[PDB]
Amino acid sequence: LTLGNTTSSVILTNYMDTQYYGEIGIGTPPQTFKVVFDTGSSNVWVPSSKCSRLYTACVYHKLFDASDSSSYKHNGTELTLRYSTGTVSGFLSQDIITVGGITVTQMFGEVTEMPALPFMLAEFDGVVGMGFIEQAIGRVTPIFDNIISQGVLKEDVFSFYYNRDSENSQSLGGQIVLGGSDPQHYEGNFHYINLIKTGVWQIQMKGVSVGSSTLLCEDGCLALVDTGASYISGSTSSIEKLMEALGAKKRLFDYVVKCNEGPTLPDISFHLGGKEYTLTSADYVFQESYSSKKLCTLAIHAMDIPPPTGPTWALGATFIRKFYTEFDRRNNRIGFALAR
Numbered sequence: 467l468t469l470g471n472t473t474s475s476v477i478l479t480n481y482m483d484t485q486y487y488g489e490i491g492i493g494t495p496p497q498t499f500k501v502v503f504d505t506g507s508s509n510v511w512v513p514s515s516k517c518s519r520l521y522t523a524c525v526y527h528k529l530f531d532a533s534d535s536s537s538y539k540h541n542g543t544e545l546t547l548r549y550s551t552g553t554v555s556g557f558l559s560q561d562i563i564t565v566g567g568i569t570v571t572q573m574f575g576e577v578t579e580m581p582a583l584p585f586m587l588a589e590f591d592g593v594v595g596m597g598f599i600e601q602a603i604g605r606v607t608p609i610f611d612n613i614i615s616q617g618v619l620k621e622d623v624f625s626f627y628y629n630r631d632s633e634n635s636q637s638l639g640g641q642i643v644l645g646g647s648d649p650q651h652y653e654g655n656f657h658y659i660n661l662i663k664t665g666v667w668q669i670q671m672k673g674v675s676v677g678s679s680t681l682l683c684e685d686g687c688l689a690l691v692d693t694g695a696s697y698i699s700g701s702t703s704s705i706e707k708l709m710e711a712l713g714a715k716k717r718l719f720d721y722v723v724k725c726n727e728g729p730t731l732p733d734i735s736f737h738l739g740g741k742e743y744t745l746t747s748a749d750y751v752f753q754e755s756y757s758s759k760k761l762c763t764l765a766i767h768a769m770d771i772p773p774p775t776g777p778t779w780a781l782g783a784t785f786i787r788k789f790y791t792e793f794d795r796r797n798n799r800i801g802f803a804l805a806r
């Protein structure tokens with residue numbers, strides 16, 4: 467592990483509080499793609515020009531076309547990524563990738579099979595996996611590992627800032643710092659929690675409290691910190707119980723309350739390491755109206771994450787929006803600080 471003197475940032479756009487994505491270029495000359503930087507996974511991929519146009523999701527996204535890149539290097543090994551919420555499939559290629567002004571030779575999936583659900587609902591084209599190599603499919607070095615190798619970054623860490631969605635363009639949607647954190651976007655001190663184990667961005671959670679009565683995760687539980695998840699999530703059975711405590715109605719994909727009931731909802735607290743992380747209802751209610759005649763969705767969802775990573779809660783965009791997040795690969799921990 468060699469360290470340098472550099473920090474790089476990636477400017478993110480915020481689509482509807484649910485997808486935070488930045489721009490990368492692949493190939494010579496660069497082909498640009500909108501991508502999510504996803505700590506829940508470790509593979510890079512973008513849709514391929516070899517994706518059959520019978521996948522409509524391929525009709526509606528940018529396609530990487532190897533035949534137009536002079537730095538491409540073929541490989542071709544089959545690759546399937548089976549996330550908890552959908553799957554993609556294709557084959558591995560290598561090309562040069564530009565991210566935050568850093569150029570790195572990276573092996574990545576060209577995706578030729580991309581389901582309309584969920585992918586038709588993606589504003590982004592691809593994914594940049596930010597997790598450990600232990601979780602990379604095909605044993606492919608993740609992009610951050612390859613950048614670390616160049617010995618240019620000041621610290622073996624990266625940090626996420628997710629903004630609250632603005633209508634006004636001079637609000638940046640968010641920011642990733644590779645090799646550091648950005649003190650403009652947090653205040654107070656970081657508090658850290660150790661990873662249970664290297665290989666996964668998952669920490670122990672000591673309790674989940676709702677208001678001043680209800681207690682979940684009473685004996686302890688897992689918290690995956692997932693920058694590529696829209697929401698905070700829990701196991702179906704946990705969320706069943708959290709939602710009971712809030713007076714919420716279950717639908718197929720989400721929970722809702724009558725919009726007028728939203729601001730009366732208690733705080734929700736997450737006990738991580740030394741500290742309680744508290745969200746008020748404004749942090750977890752999509753308060754689109756104050757009417758009793760309208761439903762408001764909640765940014766806390768049920769999700770069963772498979773083993774071995776699950777069963778687990780996941781702290782996604784709903785959480786990061788309040789808490790500036792640092793991922794420390796040197797010391798295998800995660801730090802949180804109040805975002806600003």
Ligand SMILES: CC[C@H](C[C@H](O)[C@@H](N)CN1CC(=O)N(c2ccccc2Cl)CC1(C)C)C(=O)N[C@@H]1[C@@H]2C[C@@H]3C[C@H]1C[C@@](O)(C3)C2
Pocket residue numbers: 484485502504505506507508547548549550551552584585587588593601602603690692693694695696771775776
């Ligand atoms: C362990 C949880 C982890 C979660 C996952 O990284 C998601 N956060 C990714 N998101 C899903 C999603 O649904 N997105 C989405 C959001 C809004 C609209 C449309 C879309 Cl497609 C965006 C992305 C970034 C693709 C995972 O399954 N990881 C899987 C990876 C890594 C490792 C653990 C799991 C099984 C593996 O075989 C090994 C592959």
Ligand SMILES: *[C@@H]1O[C@H](CO)[C@@H](O)[C@H](O)[C@H]1NC(C)=O
Pocket residue numbers: 540541542543
């Ligand atoms: C793809 O990459 C792996 C990684 O070392 C390699 O062993 C394999 O032979 C490659 N396949 C081809 C056809 O280039």
